[PDB]
């Protein structure tokens, strides 16, 4: 609710990306003016999904799972605030989706 808040900056792993039927690669999204400076974002490797035989099955699809997260962005020098709070959408990994439920 308040436009300006004081924030204390002092804060008090798996291989699913590889073993998934919808595997993904992680990319280091880096911004030195942001909290957090590094966010690991996922990009699906294939269009289809990997079947029991290790082949890509195109009857299903790999899709990214996106999550809305809070970030602090450094304001331009000498602004009334040091940071601005923003909400971004981050792909955290991939899941496999069928054509119908």
């Amino acid at each position: 609710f308040p436009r300006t808040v004081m924030v204390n900056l002092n804060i008090h792993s798996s291989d699913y990306y590889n073993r998934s039927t919808s595997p993904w690669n992680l990319h280091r999204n880096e911004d030195p003016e942001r909290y957090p400076s590094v966010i690991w974002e996922a990009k699906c490797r294939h269009l289809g999904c990997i079947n029991a035989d290790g082949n890509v099955d195109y009857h299903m699809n790999s899709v990214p799972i996106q999550q809305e997260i809070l970030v602090l962005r450094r304001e331009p020098p000498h602004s009334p605030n040091s940071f601005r709070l923003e909400k971004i959408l981050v792909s955290v990994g991939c899941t496999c989706v069928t054509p119908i439920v």
């Epitope: 990319h27 999204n29 880096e30 911004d31 003016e33 990214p64 792909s91």
Partner: antibody, heavy 118, light 108 residues
């Protein structure tokens, strides 16, 4: 201002090499992908390839793989597109464009016109 | 692996008329689809992203709809500056990102 500024127009002869640039400013160059798009005179937009400047992950369209090289220098927020031997068929406008992961090309460079002729 | 096809190749309409531009995907692209406008001597301009979100500064007369394989860009009432080339583009899987374009011409 968030922008992509491309290097100036080029006039080259066949067989000559060329490296064109795309510099970002007003945003984190290591937070977005860069795509390279070709547009021959009076024709549509053709994807050439992409690069994620933060880790130099690069992908090419199968139509351009082996014909061009895409690279980036994140220390100067710049992406590049290069040819080792130009041909007359490379005469076209070249755009670079930013896109976030699973996002549209929201920021576009002004284009670099490349003319190749004897 | 994914191809976008636009229809018609050329749409000829009068100012004030409603324009309907089609974009069909060979297989689902979910909502990872954008529309661009391109005027001569200019770079493409993002109009719509995520099938139906207007980009900042884009007039309300432009709207996008669809999901999966069938998408539509609608211009409720054609302004003279709207006669240009329009492209659809998917960012789900590459695949082939762009549609071949639809040229909007003035009918007189």
């Amino acid at each position: 201002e968030v922008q992509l500024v491309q290097s100036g127009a080029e006039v080259k002869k066949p067989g000559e090499s060329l490296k064109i640039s795309c510099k970002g400013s007003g945003y984190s160059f290591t937070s977005y992908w860069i795509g390279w798009v070709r547009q021959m005179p009076g024709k549509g937009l053709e994807w050439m390839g992409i690069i994620y400047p933060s880790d130099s992950d690069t992908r090419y369209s199968p139509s351009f793989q082996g014909q061009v090289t895409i690279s980036a220098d994140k220390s100067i927020s710049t992406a590049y597109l290069q040819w080792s031997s130009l041909k007359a068929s490379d005469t076209a406008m070249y755009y670079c464009a930013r896109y976030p992961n699973y996002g549209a090309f929201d920021i576009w460079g002004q284009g670099t016109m490349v003319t190749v002729s004897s | 692996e994914i191809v976008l096809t636009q229809s018609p190749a050329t749409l000829s309409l009068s100012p004030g008329e409603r324009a309907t531009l089609s974009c069909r995907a060979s297989q689902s692209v979910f909502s990872y689809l954008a529309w661009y406008q391109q005027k001569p001597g200019q770079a493409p301009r993002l109009l719509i992203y995520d099938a139906s979100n207007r980009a900042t500064g884009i007039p309300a007369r432009f709207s996008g709809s669809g999901s999966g394989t069938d998408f539509t860009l609608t211009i409720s009432s054609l302004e003279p500056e709207d006669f240009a080339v329009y492209y659809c583009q998917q960012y789900f899987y590459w695949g082939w990102p762009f549609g071949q374009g639809t040229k909007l011409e003035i009918k007189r």
